[PDB]
């Protein structure tokens, strides 16, 4: 009878220091369980997890998004486009037993922020307040983007998340991390060489390398460079579109600018659909393990 208002409520008597302990715990496990995915580690899959739980938002009706933590329910957990994310969820469950007070939504999003900061990325301001919601508010499968599309699809897909041209090119730069796995998505290979350290390699590779369209083993087409890298059709579409292209060239020249827009965009992605009452604390900037002597 009235739209959904998702009010942020800080977990009962919790503060910055409480949340810095959960970060430390995730960040240390990232350092210790370093064998995963042939030594890429859990960093890339945790930021993909942070994005996929947030990517379900629909601005029009305020359904989906990070708030509800509804990834824990089998309907969203088993979404075909969430394949490979179980490994990210498994990494976070021992930490959740350690801190059962933190909400699911708060943990998945913190996991993404922690991963980026740990992988030498920019500091991303984070906020608490996500509250776990019932099994009936779990969003239907299919709200996440498909990789076999062009720039037009990407521009309009992101309008749904309230993201402009500058924000979508910035958010896509997260593909400097990890790889595509044929068993999870039908595409195989990395976007770059430094798969576990956050740089602007994505953009540098996009326009500096020689791209040839080819078929992989899952019968899907992808752009392959002679250097062993790959690009998804939507990644390549960022250089086909004149407007997206001049923001790709901007970031390839200035990493700082890229480090400032992603953090603004990534924060905005994780905070989408949540209303923070004015008594709520200012966003937290967590210290990395390196800043704490580790």
């Amino acid at each position: 009878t009235t739209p959904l208002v998702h009010v942020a409520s800080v977990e009962k008597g919790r503060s910055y220091e409480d949340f810095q302990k959960v970060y430390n715990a995730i960040a240390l496990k990232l350092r210790e369980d370093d064998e995963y995915d042939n030594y890429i580690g859990y960093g890339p899959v945790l930021v993909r997890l942070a994005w996929h739980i947030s990517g379900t938002w629909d601005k029009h009706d305020n359904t989906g998004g990070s708030y509800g933590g509804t990834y824990r329910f089998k309907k969203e957990f088993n979404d075909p486009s969430n394949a490979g994310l179980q490994n990210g969820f498994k990494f976070l469950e021992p930490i959740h037993k350690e801190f059962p007070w933190i909400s699911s939504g708060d943990l998945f999003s913190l996991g993404g922020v922690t991963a980026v900061q740990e992988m030498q990325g920019p500091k991303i301001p984070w906020r608490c307040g996500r509250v776990d919601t019932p099994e009936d508010t779990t969003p239907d499968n299919g709200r996440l983007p498909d990789a076999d599309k062009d720039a037009g699809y990407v521009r309009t897909f992101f309008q749904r998340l309230n993201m402009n041209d500058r924000e979508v090119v910035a958010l896509m730069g997260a593909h400097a991390l990890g790889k595509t796995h044929l068993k999870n998505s039908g595409y195989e290979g990395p976007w770059g060489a430094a798969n576990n350290v956050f740089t602007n390699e994505f953009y540098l590779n996009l326009l500096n390398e020689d791209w040839k369209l080819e078929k992989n083993d899952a019968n899907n087409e992808q752009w392959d460079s002679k250097s062993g890298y790959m690009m998804l059709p939507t990644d390549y579409s960022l250089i086909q579109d004149p407007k997206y292209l001049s923001i790709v060239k901007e970031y390839a020249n200035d990493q700082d600018k890229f480090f400032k827009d992603f953090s603004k965009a990534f924060e905005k992605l994780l905070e989408n659909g949540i209303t923070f009452p004015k008594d709520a604390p200012s966003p937290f900037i967590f210290k990395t393990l390196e800043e704490q002597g580790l």
């Binding site: 350290v197 740089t199 390196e290």
Partner: protein, 108 residues
Amino acid sequence: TEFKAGSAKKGATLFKTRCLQCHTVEKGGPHKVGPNLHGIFGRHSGQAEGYSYTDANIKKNVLWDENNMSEYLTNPKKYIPGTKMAFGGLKKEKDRNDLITYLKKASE
């Protein structure tokens, strides 16, 4: 030495997974994102044979021995600030010894 010495089979897989995308070890090697590291032990930094290093790697100019190399591979940007080697670091000593032992053997 201060650094012990480990498995050269384990270090092979550590190189293959964490260093191969950017480096080679071979006699006459395809220079990539990073330099061909053959004959690294005993030479200086920024020390070419053809490659464009950042002025930081050249000006550190340390002889690459097993010990200062281990300190480097723990945190590349703390040891040589301003370097463009985008690597997080081998935080486990066994991994460093297993790798350097393979490296000493492969880059002979």
